[PDB]
Paper text:
We report here structural and functional studies on the arginine-sensitive NAGK from [name] (yNAGK). The AAK domains occupy the center of the molecule flanked by two pairs of interacting DUF619 domains.
A truncated form of yNAGK spanning from residue 58 to 356, corresponding to the AAK domain and lacking the C-terminal DUF619 domain, was produced as a soluble protein in milligram amounts in E. coli. Four subunits, organized as a dimer of dimers with D2 local symmetry, were found in the asymmetric unit of these crystals. In the structure of the truncated yNAGK without NAG (resolution 2.95 Å), the lid is observed in two different open conformations, which are, however, less open than in the structure of the NAG-free EcNAGK. These three elements form a platform or “stand” which mediates and determines the interactions between the dimers across the Q axis of the tetramer (labeled “interdimeric junction”). At each interdimeric junction, a four-helix bundle is formed by both interacting “stands”, burying an approximate area of 910 Å2 per subunit. In any case, the interactions mediated by these stands result in the association of two yNAGK dimers into a relatively flat rectangular tetramer with approximate dimensions of 35 Å×109 Å×83 Å. This tetramer is perforated by a central hole of 18 Å diameter, which is formed between the two domain bodies and the two interdimeric junctions.
Author numbering:
A (entry chain B), D (entry chain D): 63 to 351
B (entry chain A), C (entry chain C): 62 to 352
The structure:
Amino acid sequence: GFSATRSTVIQLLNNISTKREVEQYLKYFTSVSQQQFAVIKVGGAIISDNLHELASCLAFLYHVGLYPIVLHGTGPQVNGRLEAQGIEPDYIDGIRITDEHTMAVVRKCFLEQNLKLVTALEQLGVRARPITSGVFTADYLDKDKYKLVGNIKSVTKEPIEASIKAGALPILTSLAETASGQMLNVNADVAAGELARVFEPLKIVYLNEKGGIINGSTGEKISMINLDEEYDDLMKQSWVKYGTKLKIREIKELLDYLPRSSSVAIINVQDLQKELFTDSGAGTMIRRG
Amino acid sequence: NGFSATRSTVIQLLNNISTKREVEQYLKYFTSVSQQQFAVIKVGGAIISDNLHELASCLAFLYHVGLYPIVLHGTGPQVNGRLEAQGIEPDYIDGIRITDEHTMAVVRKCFLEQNLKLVTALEQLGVRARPITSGVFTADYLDKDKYKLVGNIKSVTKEPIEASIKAGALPILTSLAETASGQMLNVNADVAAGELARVFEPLKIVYLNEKGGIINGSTGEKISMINLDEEYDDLMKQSWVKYGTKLKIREIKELLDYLPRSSSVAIINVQDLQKELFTDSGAGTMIRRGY
Amino acid sequence: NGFSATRSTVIQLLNNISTKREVEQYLKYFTSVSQQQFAVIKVGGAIISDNLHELASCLAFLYHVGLYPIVLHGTGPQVNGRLEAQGIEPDYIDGIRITDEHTMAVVRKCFLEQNLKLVTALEQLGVRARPITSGVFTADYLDKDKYKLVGNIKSVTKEPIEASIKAGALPILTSLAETASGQMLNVNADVAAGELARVFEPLKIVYLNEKGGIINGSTGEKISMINLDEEYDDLMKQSWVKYGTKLKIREIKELLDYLPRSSSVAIINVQDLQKELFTDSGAGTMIRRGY
Amino acid sequence: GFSATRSTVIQLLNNISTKREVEQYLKYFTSVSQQQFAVIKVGGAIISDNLHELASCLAFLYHVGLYPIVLHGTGPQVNGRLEAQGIEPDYIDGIRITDEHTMAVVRKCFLEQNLKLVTALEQLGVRARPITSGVFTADYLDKDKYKLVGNIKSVTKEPIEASIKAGALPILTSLAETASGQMLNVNADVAAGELARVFEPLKIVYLNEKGGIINGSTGEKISMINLDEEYDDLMKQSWVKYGTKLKIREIKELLDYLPRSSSVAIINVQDLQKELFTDSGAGTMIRRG
């Protein structure tokens, strides 16, 4: 069955200081149920920039009996390989145009990156299960406008539950499929949001490198956002562009559905353990007012 | 590859051993230090719904003695039943299914369920299994207007399968393919399995069916041996060589034209899998290039 | 020493942790690399028959976090009951049992049963335990004609206890002794445990009883602290210091005259054992040399 | 739970060739009833002369799931340490006179040797349980004639069954105790016989260095003895003296009680595996006619 080395337990004791922190951990350690601990979204950047530390944190979670649902993008590497072979990434309305060749590259990267993370975990003794399809079902977002780029309509939970029941961290790509079986590129930030919607986990964490969201107006990191008060305002501010725009969109929608206790934490990997085990996060914390 | 003989492993190993010949045959495989892949194993989907426990037990045994097979399975009768439940009739032409987009939705859904059933079946026996549903087979369309979403395989990416085996987990593949662009295409599992054989050059190639081999429809008897250099051309021009047997016996001949003379594809019932691999049984239909 | 925190270990470790002080106390013992023996633990036989599950769980925890204690237990009330069943009355004189040959047969048989119960209780929680029924305590007769087969311990052979701990199994000792010539002699478990302390110089010395410490019979309150350099002589000349408490408090004073000032003997209820060892509880009666 | 390495299984396959050899192993591997596999008596000599190989064989049995009951003497080492300190071993009627000091040495040796075998096993990954008392109960053989030397009246099986149930080989000394708790020295060869009597195991094996019993008349090893025909005769032969005398006595008595299928095999360690797995022993095989 389950057992934990002295390092693992030392690291557990290093994360847990108060009584409610203790009870929180015990709640999810001993939980037998299909309401999970965490959805963690991993920026693709992180896998090629900081794999060891990403793999170590997740490894630690697994070693203390916590099975977060991991879903990663493949952002920069796709743009890299396109540019590498004399192709310039095409964009419009803040979303990538994906033809027969571009999806070929997106698929290739997703597989490469997903296997990199899975293997880094396995090497650290963590049972990791790649889940590259059969989770997201989508119809086209705007067939003519964006080509092979979808919009998630439902989430089949079964593969993920099967994975956790077997003692393996599910490691998901954000690729979707039409029912008919055309793979459609979907934004990792909204794909994680849809996982969060159905699994209603305790913790929703998005990992990026900047460790939050920066207010361009001041150049200071935004520590808290109270959507009820600030959503409409924040969307009008000129410094909010591109990927911070639709990220905040999904997170409002997501938190409109989820109860008042839930929140989304946008953080750096180095704060992950501290975010999961305690009620004091760093980075940008986004909750409903 | 982790060797770890559990109680049930030890009992299964010894159960039908009776002569020093059989003992010496097992020692051959256990004392070996070959970096060669042990087996490609094609599973009729029927076997997943009808004999999941037997299938899983036999694969468990191979896992536990550190002789990991690559497993490729089809979707069984379910697909047609599920379509029959909604009322859609299966159209085959020349032995291949007219897989339209509505039909594909059901094929996908069946593959995913069958695949996870077998994978969980193994996990429940403490056998690490890794479901590989995509990124292995890449295919062009076979004939868009004729068969619709059915593929002809062109390349095989070995990486996920290897990753799985190195990680200590049996790779369990569905036999779907995708175009480079990401459209899933249904592919004949007998062909799919053959392609894996072509690329992994394994010690044993095994096809599992419920009939327990290939039946000679004219004499009503199971065919034990097939020398393909001599028997192939006359065996093909027959009335009892079915829609699905044409493609199965064809791919096997093409595969053994590419593989060396030492190789051979056995077609057997699940219950005869252990004795087919380790003893040199006359069970099922054995097929080889021949003199 | 093997650290291996099972689920129940992790739950027991965290269950009463509430401040960073308690967390830091557990890190003290886990990050340590001391070659010092962790504990000698004396078990009233009553606890084996009455609270075996609690005893076993608490020892299981120490085992699983690799802080193995030496455990020395008595034979509880059973002996007297078993004698009372056959009709023989227990004779004590000055606080020690007149153990004749018939009585010894019962004492032996009880010790062996109690010892195996506790050992098996541990094994059933997946804790290796080794029953050590002889070859540890060697004794002269205390007073043949007075107490008959009762011993005064003279030497202790450490070897079996060390062998056990090195093999990864808790040593579970009965408190019998033998003459060099091999005659078994009944010995006071409080004294026996003290002798192990004397020879192993452990971090913690703990005596388990059901009462939960020593009760001050005049005020009806439990005594939390005893500074023996100051309090001993006046604490002895009292009406509520019983037959059995004289010898218990006496041996503890003699032992701490031999041990250094850092040492201390705690007397507590089984349920407070974990918090007594790792946190610095005020539960039970604590006894030390003092200023 | 239970698992076996590739070496262990290779060695199992090397011992098992025929179908009934296979069925025999499986019968005792899968436990079935309160039926023990083997009582093995180990000459004390073997523990100080050939420990590694003794430990390896027993280790192998344990690794294939067989739990023999091991009971060892302490023959030569006791005589050694007496002589080592200027004391000559006293003897009479073929049995050792054991006073306050001699028993002191016997006890010391039994503990030393019993821990040596137990540790040799533990070092090879075998769970071994020392069982030094509480098994044999004996009254004096002839108090005045031999002093502290007993005669076994009963065997308490519980410690041994407890050991096997816990997955640990019981490793017994041949020391007995009066009910009143005087330890009485008992002959390992007859002590094993009393274990054999109550446990009615499939295999009774006595290990010695010569690997059997030698007929002094010819100087040839005796391969078979049919007690019904030869007991009375063999006991009259002048070459049968000392420890072969009362060894053959117990084995006749033992086999009078046990059924016709049972036998005692007196062999060398190097033949142990072959003795236990097959119906063809070396050394001296003693059965009822």
